[PDB]
Design a protein around this ligand. Structure first.
Ligand code: HEM
Ligand SMILES: [K+]
Length: 291
């Protein structure tokens, strides 16, 4: 399988900047979602989820084909709750119908990160919608009740090393777990809609207590009222992961550069960018444009 990126006929940077701004303005507007968290978090997760189905072995899955839009993928249990971000995007797609789905799902994630004060994430256009039959089966997204070895093993399927994994997990600082979605409940910290290194800080500074939740699952609960998944907790259990956590806890900038690179990589896995493809775009945030 080869998926060559193909620029949407006749579109340039400026056209994308507009999709961006449209997402951004809508984020600003619908701020009541999930009790004032806003849609930022769910969009980052949608973008990660449409991309985590990838398999470096056979090149199936990944964000290229916009398969999330099909039933099999859309109804994946590990995708519970993502429908809210889908619906958020929907009007947007209507306003800009020439964008491919993979392009849009992924741009939402970038927009989300940047609008929430995170780092700038270079983004590339060119994903092409593929047919219903290219939809990966359910089962490729990771479980949360595991440990560091699982995570390690899991992420390898996506070509991510220790450093990327840890960088990538910092996104857990955003949003929260929801009992009805995954059988877990609670936020990871206090600033849940502004992008920071809080995740690492929390993991190193709170005094976590293992407990069972209402869904009969285990989670690490802290006095502050925060929770961590077994998989999140696992980053302190593993020696290699822990030194990285420590690095990010001390230097938000390193975290940001690392997250940036990894997130783009993550969204670009499985895609072949031809030689003449335009360079990756760096979008202006609403504020940078004075809107
Ligand atoms: C071991 C790998 C991962 C596991 C098992 C995991 C699983 C989870 C769980 C179970 C949820 C809660 C969903 C809910 O009930 O609504 C979730 C929340 C979320 N996940 Fe992950 N995740 C992992 C990797 C990541 C990565 C790589 C990203 C993005 C870079 C990330 C971003 C998010 C975000 C932002 C939230 C909050 C969503 C919201 O507030 O609705 N996750 N994660
Ligand atoms: K979270």
């Amino acid at each position: 399988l080869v998926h060559v990126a193909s620029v949407e006929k006749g579109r340039s940077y400026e056209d994308f900047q507009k999709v961006y701004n449209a997402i951004a303005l809508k984020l600003r507007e619908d701020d009541e979602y999930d009790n004032y968290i806003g849609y930022g978090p769910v969009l980052v997760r949608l973008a990660w989820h449409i991309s985590g189905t990838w398999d470096k072995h056979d090149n199936t899955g990944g964000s290229y084909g916009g398969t999330y839009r099909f039933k099999k993928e859309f109804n994946d249990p590990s995708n519970a709750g993502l429908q809210n971000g889908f619906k958020f995007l929907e009007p947007i797609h209507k306003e800009f119908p020439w964008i491919s789905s993979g392009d849009l799902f992924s741009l939402g994630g970038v927009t989300a990160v940047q609008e929430m004060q995170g780092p700038k994430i270079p983004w590339r256009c060119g994903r092409v919608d593929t047919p219903e039959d290219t939809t990966p089966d359910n089962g490729r997204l990771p479980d949360a009740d595991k440990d560091a070895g699982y995570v390690r093993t899991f992420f390898q399927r996506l070509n991510m090393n220790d450093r990327e994994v840890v960088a990538l997990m910092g996104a857990h600082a955003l949003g929260k777990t929801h009992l009805k979605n995954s059988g877990y409940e609670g936020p990871q910290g206090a600033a849940n809609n502004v992008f920071t290194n809080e995740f690492y800080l929390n993991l190193l500074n709170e005094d976590w207590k293992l407990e069972k939740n209402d869904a009969n699952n285990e989670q690490w609960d802290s006095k502050s009222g925060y929770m961590m998944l077994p998989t999140d907790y696992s980053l302190i259990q593993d020696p290699k992961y822990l030194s990285i956590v420590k690095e990010y806890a001390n230097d938000q900038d390193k975290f940001f550069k690392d997250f940036s690179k990894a997130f783009e990589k993550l969204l670009e896995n499985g895609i072949t960018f031809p030689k003449d493809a335009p360079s990756p775009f760096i979008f202006k945030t609403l504020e940078e444009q004075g809107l």
